[PDB]
Design a protein around this nucleic acid. Structure first.
Length: 1137
RNA sequence: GAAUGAUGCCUGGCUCGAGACCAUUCAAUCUCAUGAUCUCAUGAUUAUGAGAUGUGAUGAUGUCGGACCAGGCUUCAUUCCCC
């Protein structure tokens, strides 16, 4: 109607406070105005960004309904209550595209006010409710404190709020006139009030039900001696207090008192029955024993009283007049929720009319209630008509769409009569009447009804515009507006309050450090001391205790007059501290055992060249050597050009810088082969090659071409070619001119001697291809030598290193890829380089930060041990010059370089290449069988992330460094271990090295769980289990000792290395791998590996698995179902087979 | 010209089993409270939000082996060949 348009004018005009109950859908008109300013292309098109802020999340689901019900212009929502620490950044980055309206609660938006995000998020527009609550304790006031100065482009110029839904500010005697606290709040949020001005724009279609009072209950309440009974049971409770979760049961007693008081004793019997159900659940779940004792105490007292009140077993006729054609919509309003829970039982019980309830969400430790979703389910059931008859009953009572409820029954709710007027607008009145069953007993409800009357008086008073606004000027300052001025003056107050809130939240955040032993550890804590100074100068010593990771924040100070203010001041100390912290070619000849020779401009260096190199074939080894007799021997380059054409002819058509067999060079042979009836001669074919190419070792004259093709096998009857000239005639149509010549014993050059002797060739029927078979040997043996040559020229480039103690003859093996060309791998020096990598990165890292954080510098190490960084060190070298899919083992080759260049000289030259590319006490002492000097680092190692009431330091850093050092040390041993196993088996042994369990096994070789001091007893209980296993944190404190002696040794490994190695060694050669079962099973049944499901049941055995080749056995243990079930199955199988 | 088997190696994806680590989910925990009510007041009582921790499993991802098929190369036996 019209008043919507009027407040459209007033609100689009200026910042606006409206005070109208239901506003005829105030949020509707808010949506309309926001769509108006949206369709308007604003100055900044995203500055609009208006959110209706509520804290009520089922109401947020109503806004899901609403904001998808409207706003073709795009809008968003939250589930809320989610992990959104940095999520909000990309939430902005996506909301600027796709979410003009996003929904969130207040406190999240408060954290968004923190850290000075971009520019107050370009908001400039807002909708808000619960604005009456926006007071000193409330967040919204603290928002408007920093938002009072709407300076930057006026980031928050116009303000729109809703105080209509909660009108119970408290103070009708202080606010009999129209504006008292209203002036105060409208000066707070800087938004102008607009009142309803009249009821002419209301009540035309907004009827208000007449209020009907009742006297005393239709409850019986006819047992007054049970009041004295409950007074004696109150004395029982006083004994329970003098004893001192007892208080919850105490309040349960108070509750059942209220039930028996207000609704008779039969109802309190039903309440005792619900107490039996709740108390049965209490006796079930509760493991605490004093409280379970008092649960049994509850059962005896409640069985006494409730069994009396079963023999003892309101407003009913009110319900009954409304029962004929039951109410389409019914609302009942009471506070005590457990009574509301016990109603439908009684209502099915005596009058046989079904009833339903809506619970509240506040509860503790799996409290039986409707969840928020379950409340929405109940609401949807209420949207169904049958459950609407069942009735709706709650205590939250806000933000639902329930219309035209004929019966209003605020049964004994009078604290928020103004909120009831909310619930009165909730329903349009079709001749409906509100009903107020108040007991005629206890007449202070006369006072409550005149308070209601004064409430409508004050509503009528504010309905007159400015009835106490422009009226009081000085007396308003003597009433409350000098008590409520623009108090924003104190600048350290807002820094102090922000420091309070943020420092407690950051206390929580740094409490989320990494406890490990327990899910939550109380690392920050405090105690309070009344530091009242005689004279009225009360002070408060706030004693502040911190974790070890918090260095310099312990404060025990009578710093401020109030206790919470002293905590605010210690938060100020903390916030300052976290501002700080957190915030003529050389002739050289080749010999082997016309000899060969290379021709290159380069002169081979004697040291760089291997003295002899080896060759390995199926027959035998052949080794070779070279010698530079004539330095700069000169041959004519044109003859070189012709014979080079012949050399590439050898490569190209014969084999299909340059090598030479030298007799004194046999140039004439080179040129001869450059160009290149009858009787046979055996001497010409004593060593030859015959082009179609075959080897000619020897002949046979006894077998001639006229003789038969001997085929010993006669099953299929293969064609025995009666002459070999007839064999040639049958296949190629060829006959020999003189078939009497001997037959060539054939020898095959292609890539048991009887099959070789099978081939027989005719001399003329073959065009010789001219080479001696020994030179055939040499020529086909040339290519591996060329691979050797390219190896030694790479050795020319690389033996020419930056620095090199020894020649890089084994770097030749390091350069070659693992398992490539049958040659050796590089993995010993590789894993050695990896171990040194970890050791030296720990070295330089602690060189950087002895002020480090442990896991943070762990992240920094992992950053340094990122493969791509070492890939870039390779790039700034370029071992490429001696196609990477970005996932390559080239980093491992670099590691090989690192290890081998340690091996060539010292560690130090290896570090040069790195810079070239990259950059109880005596009891546990004798338990380790050792001696110790500085017990401070020992204390540092024994300190645990949990320590009983004491904190000095942490062992996590020492664990880190001893970890890296023993990586180095174990790797150094294992590559001093010259077993030279399969690299798979080398991988197995290094993996067997890395296991915290066997480090804990060393710890119980010294039994340090008896020696460790620790705050947590459940952690010791977990350790005592693991000790009973052997007759987790133990290996960790072992590494802390390792690091501690690394400090003691001045970063030396050898001294404590000597101590650890004998106890280290003798277990390693037995494999005894705990991943026997699944590895050995999936490998022992490659063809048929089948599997049965386990995770259906918890701890226990279920191992009738469908494996076939190994067989099917079941093995028994306490918890084998994770691992060792298949191991016990293999045990029973090998017992079976 | 080739192939067959057996023979080990290596590569791809797929899968199963352990590490690590990321997200989800539901419970829970602990703070932070905020309104109202008595209490001169403290204090007590009642309604309702924020997180963070978080149990389990889920989905991943990154290492590490399995198998599995798909393949490249080679020995040990032959069959066959090429003038």
């Amino acid at each position: 109607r019209r008043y919507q348009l009027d407040v459209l004018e007033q609100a689009k005009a200026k910042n606006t406070i409206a005070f109208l109950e239901t506003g005829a859908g105030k949020t509707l008109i808010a949506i309309l105005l926001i769509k108006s300013v949206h369709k308007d292309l604003m100055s900044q098109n995203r500055k609009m960004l208006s959110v209706f802020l509520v804290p009520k999340v089922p109401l947020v689901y109503q806004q899901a309904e609403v904001i998808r019900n409207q706003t073709c212009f795009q809008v968003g929502h939250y589930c809320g209550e989610m992990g959104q620490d940095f999520w909000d950044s990309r939430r902005w980055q996506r909301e600027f595209e796709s979410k003009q309206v996003l929904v969130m609660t207040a406190q999240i938006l408060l954290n968004i006010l923190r850290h000075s995000i971009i520019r107050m998020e370009t908001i400039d527009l807002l909708i808000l409710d619960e604005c009456h609550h926006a007071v000193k304790k409330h967040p919204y006031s603290l928002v408007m404190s920093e938002f009072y100065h709407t300076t930057p482009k006026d980031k928050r110029p116009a303000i729109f709020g809703m105080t209509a839904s909660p009108v119970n500010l408290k103070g009708v005697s202080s606010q009999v006139d129209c504006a008292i606290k209203i002036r105060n709040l409208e000066t707070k949020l800087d938004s102008t009030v607009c009142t309803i001005k009249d009821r002419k724009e209301l009540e035309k279609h907004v009827p208000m039900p007449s209020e009907i009072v009742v006297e005393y209950d239709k409850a019986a309440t006819m047992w007054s001696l049970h009041e004295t009974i409950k007074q004696m049971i109150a004395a029982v409770e006083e004994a329970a207090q003098a004893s001192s979760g007892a208080a919850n049961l105490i309040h349960k007693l108070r509750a059942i008192n209220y039930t028996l008081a207000e609704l008779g004793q039969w109802c309190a019997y039903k309440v005792g029955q619900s107490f039996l159900s709740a108390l049965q659940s209490d006796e079930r779940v509760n493991f605490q024993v004093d409280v379970k004792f008092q649960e049994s105490y509850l059962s005896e007292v409640v069985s006494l009283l409730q069994c009396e009140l079963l023999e003892g077993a309101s407003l009913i006729k009110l319900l009954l007049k409304y029962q004929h054609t039951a109410d389409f919509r019914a609302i009942v309003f009471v506070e005590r929720v457990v009574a509301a829970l016990v109603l439908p039982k009684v209502f099915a019980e005596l009058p046989s009319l079904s009833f339903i309830r809506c619970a509240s969400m506040i509860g503790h430790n799996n409290s039986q209630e409707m969840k928020s979703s379950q409340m929405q389910d109940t609401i949807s059931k209420f949207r169904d008509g049958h459950v609407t008859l069942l009735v709706a009953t709650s205590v939250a009572e806000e933000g639902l769409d329930i219309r035209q409820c004929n019966v209003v029954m605020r049964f004994d709710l009078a604290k928020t009569v103004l909120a009831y007027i909310q619930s009165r607008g909730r329903a349009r009145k079709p001749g409906s009447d509100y009903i107020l069953m108040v007991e005629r007993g206890n007449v202070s409800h006369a006072a409550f009804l005149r308070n209601a009357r004064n409430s409508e008086e004050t509503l009528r008073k504010e309905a007159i515009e400015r009835t106490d606004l422009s009226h009081l000027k000085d007396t308003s300052r003597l009433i409350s507006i000098d008590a409520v001025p623009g108090t924003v003056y104190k600048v350290e107050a807002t820094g102090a309050m922000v420091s309070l809130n943020s420092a407690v939240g950051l206390v929580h955040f740094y409490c989320s450090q990494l406890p490990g032993d327990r899910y939550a550890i109380l690392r920050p804590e405090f105690s309070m001391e009344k530091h009242e100074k005689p004279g009225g100068h009360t002070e408060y010593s706030c004693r502040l205790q911190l974790p070890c990771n918090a260095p310099f924040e312990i404060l025990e100070g009578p710093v401020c007059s109030s206790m919470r203010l002293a905590q605010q001041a210690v938060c100020l100390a903390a916030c300052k501290k976290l501002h700080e912290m957190g915030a003529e070619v050389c002739e050289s000849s080749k010999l082997f055992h016309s000899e060969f020779a290379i021709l290159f401009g380069n002169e081979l260096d004697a040291e760089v060249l291997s003295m002899s190199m080896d060759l390995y074939v199926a027959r035998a080894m052949i080794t070779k050597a070279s010698l530079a007799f004539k330095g700069s021997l000169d041959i004519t380059e044109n003859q070189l050009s012709s014979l080079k054409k012949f050399h590439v002819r050898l490569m190209s058509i014969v084999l299909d810088y340059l090598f030479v067999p030298v007799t004194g060079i046999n140039w004439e042979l080179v040129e001869k082969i450059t160009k290149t009836l009858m009787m046979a001669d055996g001497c010409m074919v004593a060593e030859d090659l015959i082009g179609k190419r075959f080897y000619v070792d020897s002949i046979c004259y006894d077998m001639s071409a006229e003789t038969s093709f001997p085929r010993k096998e006669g099953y299929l009857g293969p064609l025995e070619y009666n002459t070999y000239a007839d064999y040639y005639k049958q296949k190629y149509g060829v006959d020999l001119n003189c078939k009497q010549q001997p037959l060539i014993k054939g020898r095959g050059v292609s890539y048991v001697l009887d099959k070789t002797y099978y081939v027989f060739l005719p001399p003329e029927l073959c065009v010789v291809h001219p080479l001696s078979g020994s030179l055939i040997r040499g020529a086909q043996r040339l290519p591996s030598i060329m691979r050797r040559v390219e190896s030694m020229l790479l050795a020319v480039q690389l033996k020419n290193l930056i620095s090199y103690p020894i020649p890089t003859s084994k770097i030749l093996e390091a350069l070659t890829a693992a398992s490539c060309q049958e040659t050796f791998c590089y993995e010993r020096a590789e894993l050695l380089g990896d171990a040194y990598l970890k050791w030296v990165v720990s070295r330089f890292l602690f060189l950087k930060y002895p002020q480090k954080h442990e896991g943070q510098l762990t992240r920094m190490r992992q950053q340094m041990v990122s493969n791509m960084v070492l890939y870039q060190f390779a790039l700034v070298k370029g071992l490429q010059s001696y196609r990477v899919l970005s996932s390559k083992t080239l980093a491992d080759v670099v590691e090989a370089l690192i290890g081998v260049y340690y091996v060539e000289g010292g560690k130090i030259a290896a570090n040069h290449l790195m810079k070239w590319i990259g950059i109880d006490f005596v009891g546990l002492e004798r338990a380790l069988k050792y001696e110790f000097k500085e017990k401070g680092l020992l204390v540092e190692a024994i300190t645990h992330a949990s320590r009983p009431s004491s904190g000095v330091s942490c062992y996590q850093r020492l664990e880190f460094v001893g970890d890296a050092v023993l990586d180095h040390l174990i790797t150094r041993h294992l590559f001093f271990t010259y077993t030279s196993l399969p690299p798979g088996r080398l991988t197995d042994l290094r993996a067997a090295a890395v296991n915290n369990e066997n480090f804990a096994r060393v710890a119980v070789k010294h039994k340090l769980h008896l020696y460790l001091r620790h705050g947590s007893s459940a952690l010791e209980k977990q350790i005592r289990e693991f000790v009973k296993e052997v007759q987790k944190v133990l290996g960790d404190i072992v590494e802390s000792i390792a690091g501690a002696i690394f400090l003691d040794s001045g970063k030396d490994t050898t001294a404590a290395w000597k101590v650890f190695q004998p106890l280290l060694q003798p277990m390693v050669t037995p494999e005894t791998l705990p991943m026997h079962p699944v590895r050995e099973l999936q490998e022992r049944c490659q063809q048929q590996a089948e599997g049965l499901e386990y995770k259906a049941s918890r701890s226990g055995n279920t191992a009738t698995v469908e494996v076939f080749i190994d067989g099917v056995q079941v093995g028994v243990a306490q918890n084998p179902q994770k691992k060792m079930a298949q191991k016990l199955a293999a045990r029973n199988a090998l017992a079976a087979l």
